[PDB]
Design a protein around this ligand. Sequence first.
Ligand SMILES: [Mg+2]
Ligand SMILES: [Zn+2]
Lengths: 611, 138, 1049, 58
Amino acid sequence: PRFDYVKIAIASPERIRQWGERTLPNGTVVGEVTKPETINYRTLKPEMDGLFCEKIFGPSKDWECWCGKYKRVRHRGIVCERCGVEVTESRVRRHRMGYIKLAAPVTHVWYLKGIPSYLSILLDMALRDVEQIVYFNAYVVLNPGNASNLQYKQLLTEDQWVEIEDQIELEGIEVGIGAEAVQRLLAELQLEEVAEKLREEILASKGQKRAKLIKRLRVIDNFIATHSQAEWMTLDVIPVIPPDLRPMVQLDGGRFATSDLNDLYRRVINRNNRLARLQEILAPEIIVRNEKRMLQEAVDALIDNGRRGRTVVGANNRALKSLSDIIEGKQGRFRQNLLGKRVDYSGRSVIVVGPNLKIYQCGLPREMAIELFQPFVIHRLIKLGIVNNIKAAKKLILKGDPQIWSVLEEVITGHPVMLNRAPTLHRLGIQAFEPILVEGRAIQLHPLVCPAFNADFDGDQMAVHVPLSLEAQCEARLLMLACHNVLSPATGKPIVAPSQDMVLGCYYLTAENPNAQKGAGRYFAGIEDALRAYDHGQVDLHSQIWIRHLDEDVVTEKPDTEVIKTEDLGDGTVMKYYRERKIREGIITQYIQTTPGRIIYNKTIAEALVF
Amino acid sequence: VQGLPRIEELLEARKPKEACVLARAPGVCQVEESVDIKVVEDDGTVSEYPLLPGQNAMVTDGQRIDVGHALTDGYNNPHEILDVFFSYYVDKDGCYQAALRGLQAAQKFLVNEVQTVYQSQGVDISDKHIEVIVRQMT
Amino acid sequence: DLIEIQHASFHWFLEEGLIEELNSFSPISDYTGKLELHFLGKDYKLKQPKYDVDESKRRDASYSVQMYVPTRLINKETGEIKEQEVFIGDLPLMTERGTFIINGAERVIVNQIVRSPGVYYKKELDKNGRRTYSASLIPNRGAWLKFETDKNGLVYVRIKTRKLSAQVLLKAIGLSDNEILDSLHPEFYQKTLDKEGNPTEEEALVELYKKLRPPPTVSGGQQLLESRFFDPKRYDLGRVGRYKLNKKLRLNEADTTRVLTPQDILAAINYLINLEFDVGTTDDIDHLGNRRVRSVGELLQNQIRVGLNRLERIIRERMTVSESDALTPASLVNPKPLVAAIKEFFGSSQLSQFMDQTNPLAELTHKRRISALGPGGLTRERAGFAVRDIHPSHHGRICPVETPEGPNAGLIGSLATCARVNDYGFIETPYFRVESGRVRKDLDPVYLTADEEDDMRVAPGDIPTDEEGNIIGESVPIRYRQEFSTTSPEQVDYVAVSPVQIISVATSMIPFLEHDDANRALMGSNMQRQAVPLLRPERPLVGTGLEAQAARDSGMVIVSRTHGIVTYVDATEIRVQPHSGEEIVYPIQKYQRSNQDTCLNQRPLVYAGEDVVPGQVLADGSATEGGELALGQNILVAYMPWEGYNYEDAILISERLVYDDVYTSIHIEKFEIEARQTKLGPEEITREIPNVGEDALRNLDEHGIIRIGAWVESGDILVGKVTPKGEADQPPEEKLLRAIFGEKARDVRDNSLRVPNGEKGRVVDVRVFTREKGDELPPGANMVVRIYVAQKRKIQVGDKMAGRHGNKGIISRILPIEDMPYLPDGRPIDIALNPLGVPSRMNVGQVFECLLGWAGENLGVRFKITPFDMYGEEASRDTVHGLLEEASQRPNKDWVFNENHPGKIQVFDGRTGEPFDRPITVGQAYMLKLVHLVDDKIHARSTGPYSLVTQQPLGGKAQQGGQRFGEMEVWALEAYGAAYILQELLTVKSDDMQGRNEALNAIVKGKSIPRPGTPESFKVLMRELQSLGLDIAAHKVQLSEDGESADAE
Amino acid sequence: HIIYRSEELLGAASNRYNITVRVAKRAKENRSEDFDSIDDPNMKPAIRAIIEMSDELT
RNA sequence: UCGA
DNA sequence: GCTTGACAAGGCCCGTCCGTTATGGTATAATGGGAGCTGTCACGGATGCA
Ligand SMILES: [Mg+2]
Ligand SMILES: [Zn+2]
């Protein structure tokens, strides 16, 4: 559908179980994962309770349940009364989420071990103080009332609590350990009343610790505006990822390719079923305390493996992939699957220099163009009446008929193709071209776009991309063509220019060779008289040649306006002699001493700028 | 020889090892183990005693002191240009005009220092591309 | 011999390395003391292998041997000796070339350089304060002793944990107050004895246990300290650790090698105190005297040590549960944890690398690589600027030129030519003795082990010497204490033995190395290891002379050993008779597949009835000519720009290189298929496969497999295999189509092995490996078929060619011989290179090479020029121009040399027939053909496979993958106005199960549709954030309605 | 002369990101109007939208 | 590991 | 343009058969665990230590 904004908040335990429990035509819901079993070893079918269960996440095959007798498309939207699997599509398994009901609360590792440890800010404790209550290392006083020397939220050691047990003061003293005491300490908080208690402590006696009460006030004020509760930071219900996001496939040798999420999910349920077993048979308290500590470490390793404790491993000695380690890294879901994707209708090849070509034109081989433009060739084959479907067209393409290459010639005319070389530093590293079918197996690139792509012909490979829609073809032509990218986006200077081999051809053309004249000092009648004398053996490339040119816009190296060697003819006509010019003043005529190489260079600009 | 690490520490706004920026704009006449410069303002009354260790050189020659004229002979701290130009103008005019003149001195320092490094390597970069990222920082 | 770090290392393991590991493991005892088990390591069997060297490569096995030791199981009370040989493990043997064969693939063991064990001191300034001196006693295996010294005279001992006072460790090991101060200046030790108390022999073990293990016990403090440095099989200094302790600290005792002596800890404190008194040397971590190398004899000693420790736990867990007697000693030793320890080192470790077998130059180089990475070396992120630079102690030991560019720039080095590693693991260089200004070149060298820094004065091999009289030069440049200086020739001590002693065996194949830049000589040495073996190689004319030694040491050249008479020579064997069972047969391999898809063909060289010598070439290899090595061809070159065809490092060749079979190589590819066991039904290889007619069943012999010698093209069927299916979920469209014309579908599915795109050739080996024939098969397989297809590839447009000086390029045009320029005798030009890349990269030696090879072309003499001269300016210019004048003195060749322009002639144009305006330098260049061909770079995809989770297109040429549109490619289109191209590349081309169907249907029908749906990768991230405990959802801001949107459903 | 016709269309328009949408929205009308059997391979609907828009510009 |  | 008896074909349904599978038990005495980290550089907070 279409949405307008995305909002993120802390998931309440009533919200996590909303995704888990689904409505089924029966007395109870079945959307809870209770067993750590995934599938069977004999057949490749899952079990009725587990991480891959069909009664929770949906049917494995399309329109087929787990037990049998419903394997047709006639039954749509009903639930089998014998098994319990809804007969629907197999694409619903990647959208349904189960839940795991715990027997003991577990603090979230992002709020405890994070920066700046928002769980310890609300409790007005230290980082090491909350880390001793959680994981069962110290006791915290929850009711110090009617006692001689006891304080609220005071840490007690193991040897210190057994001394108060002998003294029964003579009243009701309540202590706690683990996350059951942290959840009780957060549930009895006063978030409406503690906000005005910190505001009167900032103005009066601030000192250096004014920023500590300011930072604590920012966390309390966020829980009132968002209408959240402070006890929601501890987890009672654990959500389960859909099973297609933790896939279990079988290789060719018979081994299964499991994920690291299945080994971390199984450690939670195996330690949760043991905790429910110890609490039923009235186990010793040193075993129940050790079981709840491993349940705290199993969920924290599932969320962020290696955040607080040691990093758990599996069979191989590498680190297991937790829920948080698939989004933060360079190989995470953000930087490898969302910002950058692998596209279809693409290809690559090595590049060779193509001279005798134009700009906005690239050389494209025949066996690569028949794969990139494959849906465009098939459409032209049915339109011309050669084939009737795709199976008759695909057999005609792979056969190698000469009529297929005549269809491919008529398709690529006017279809822009974006060329791309990695790495893409600036925006002119992706330009569009009009391809032509050439002979060979490499991309005939233009030598003028070589400083733009920063491409050298010693092993460079360039990626080829083909647009599909009609709006993408008009954007590649009007905005991304190579002819419209003369100027750089950084400065105002052009980059489409002669660089290496054409500068040496123009430097030698307009040079001055003082030995090979062969007819220097001759007068010619205009520009076209000297071009007709170069096709003959009359003049060389560097001969001193006087050219009758009546224009005044003549630029040269070290220009001058002074007149030296003034010579006067008869009838008042004066000759104005210069260093390179010879003007007959009263302007009648004007002769320019130059080389025929500079006339061929000046003729090339005339036929290119005047059309 | 320090082209690329200089542009990195300028955009990160890191604090250098040494910094000495005058807090006002007085008329300082230098009357000379370490050299000491006494700050006496003829327009004002209160003086200033700045810290100057022996490992720093001199830049001022006498009667030449701006509002944020530094004496470092090295790298300047861009965070110290803010609070000098802000606290000196928070009492004269309003706080919004003191923040506009404070951010303008920090903006002109960052653009002129990035262009200094890029021109030393023979690299042409237009000024309008640099000041867009400086606008996002200030 | 050039391979001595591999042959002498594995020979030491088979006689000293394996004996020492079994002697330290034996004997073992039980918990009570009933019986004892001790081995006899010095009497092992090492029986015969199972398969051949060539048979193990095609059968997918390993050239290994079985290891058996005699084992005596004795009992304490009852006198009984049970002698029985028990199987230990599978050990892969080293072949005759110095390599191993693991799972049918040839592998090498790269020598890894690490730090030597010993004591190292370092002056460290943690902040702007006083000068602090540290220490580090590194063992071969065990815990470290790091002694530090803070301000005000406080020396501390740190044993990872918090530091502690020096008197705590020095008194807990057992010492008195008078045995410390007599061998120590003791005035500096009074400052650290004041604020430390004064503990007794028993008043220090309690306080040591309270800080290391935070109740203290009088027996717990002794068992903790003894297990770290004094217990056997937990702390080892090594044979080289005892040698470095007696050299640095100048100790009198020796040959301990097992236990850390407590007198050595007192000497390390005494050297640390004296560093504040301005006496003593600070060690360097990058010095080669402090850096060791290890090889196969040492790396295998650590794998059996961690493999026998796992066997010790099972041998002690079986002599306690079984309380009864009369048990065999062959059941006490379980070979399973030790077999898996050797198989992990040779196949799953990082240091066992895939062998490069392109040419014999890359095979010789890969066995001599010195890499600083591995399990115990360095890290790719922990490598800095100081470890990648060249140390002054690398002169003659490690090659300063040959190193790979890119990520591993400086971490993977190469051994030099004359370098040698001793038994201690240090690199040595030979030197000639100089006595009173006279090089004593009469006796053996000295082989100094990097001890010439602070003691000796070493001159290189470039000084002009006389014939046994004296040295010609008066100012000899030397190196003394890592600094260069010029002293008198009577004051020097040693001189180098060769000018190629600094460079490696691959850099020495570059003629005129002194005229080329060091950056292009780095590229010229790497491109020489990538040259393919041609069909008919040719020896270079400007060779350096070292190609003959590298060909014999590669192992692919058959040499004589008997000094006999050759009797019979054919294309398969050579039969000679030895003289002063007398008929030996030398086998010759014909077109064997290599690791890099090249050939390993050998050709016979000798004839019948010829005297041979030990060390004579009998049959050369694929990339080896007669005697010397040959990696390329000598053809004409011209440095002239064509019409844009050699614009930016591009190559213009002629058509003469195509039809003369120049640069034509043979590539043999190998295909694989397997008839596995599907649980629905067993798969078998048949010929009658469905939906395939007679267009592909022409080369099958009624068995489903192709024959030998059949020309296969792209799209054929090599092995026809069927697979049973049990779906039975036919759509209603296919049920109506089948009911009309009949032809009910079978239960099988065609899974035949087919030829990939752009692949062709001739089938040469159709070897089938099935069961009940004498070979082992993997589980879940009935028949294994292996197909080898050979093809003959010519030189085409797009291939990457290079020379010996780093002038790489890609051919863009192949012109006919009438369009190429021609010499004034009528001979055309093969290559028209670009002269613009020469002066910008300082490639001057390639101009000296072509101008000298052109002199050797008209004379036919095949010059051998050694690098690094002779008289200055009289040995390179007047050698080339002097020998070009001798070729012009012939009466038929007067156009070769000109007086005005010496290294130039007049070249005529081939198209118009007119001469060019300026003379062009011509010559005979030696170009190579690299492995980066145009066939391996072609890839295209319309629609293929997809990913498992994100439903995105895959990546890879061998699996029909798509090109990645990364983050830098989005920023270019975002800087453009291409918003519709960016939405198309992210939605209808990747990660949309619905949008890809409608976009493909729109092109075939002819009416495109806008508005693609939500991509799949965003919905995966939405479900992953909800599993992290975050209530994240998408809403709508419409009028009086704030409802959550269902992106998934 | 197609590249000379595109530079005249991008000029005198004051927004180069807006006149390229009118070309893409006119090429879809030329494709739906060319649904008959006559199909010119040289004149694509994307190219015909640029020539027809430049003739009405003048 | 190797190419740009 | 429709209709009826006849002849097999085959899917569920309901019994038992035996391989498969979950569960509980065995009585000399046995009583705190191994395996690496020790050569990266810079910046920003957070303790903690006077
Ligand atoms: Mg390049
Ligand atoms: Zn069912």
